[PDB]
Design a protein around this ligand. Structure first.
Ligand SMILES: COC(=O)[C@@H](NC(=O)[C@@H](NC(=O)CC[C@H](O)[C@H](Cc1ccccc1)NC(=O)[C@H](C)NC(=O)[C@H](C)N)C(C)C)C(C)C
Lengths: 99, 99
């Protein structure tokens, strides 16, 4: 679909048997989600942003459905203020910037 | 032009007689530039991100040329790690997200 940018570009994801809202972010290399119940094993890691660096928990291989398309990748669950889908999953569903 | 997202979507801006590179960011409401030489007057303000909140200086009315299109808005100069062009200028040159 074409999304214009007069409002925050928010979308619905299914991940974990659970539904949430995420912001399509073209200036995020990683997908960071606020604290949620996910199973398996994971590594510690650290992500940078504006005003900070946070400690997050790295999960690989996840089932993420983003606006009905499926994808599989690395999801970092940690203390973000908003769910962020970043450039590792965005390429997988084909999003592009055009102006 | 169509930008695909396998690399960070970076573009050239002319602001202040000076040339720089900025990331087109759909998850940033405000345009935040790292510290640069701009004239006039401005207010203190504070912006949030991942990992924190920062104090920035707010200028209104600026001449920003982003990839050959012109635009005029509020630019926040402060301690970002990278130059961010946000949703207030991005609508003015027409960018859209499509997938
Ligand atoms: C190792 O990876 C690094 O740590 C690199 N980081 C990145 O690429 C990271 N991207 C980023 O860090 C880029 C910034 C994001 O796109 C955030 C998203 C946000 C909006 C609202 C609330 C909270 C967050 N926007 C903002 O911080 C903007 C300036 N803030 C605002 O618009 C506020 C809410 N009014 C991602 C990990 C998220 C860094 C070198 C650029």
């Amino acid at each position: 679909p074409q999304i214009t940018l007069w409002q925050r570009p928010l979308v619905t994801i299914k991940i974990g048997g659970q539904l949430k809202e995420a912001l399509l972010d073209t200036g995020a290399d990683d997908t960071v989600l606020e604290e949620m119940s996910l199973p398996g094993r994971w590594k510690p890691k650290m992500i940078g942003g504006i005003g900070g660096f946070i400690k997050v928990r790295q999960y690989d291989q996840i089932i993420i459905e983003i606006c009905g398309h499926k994808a599989i990748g690395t999801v970092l669950v940690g203390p973000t203020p908003v769910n962020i889908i970043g450039r590792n999953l965005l390429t997988q569903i084909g999003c592009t910037l055009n102006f």
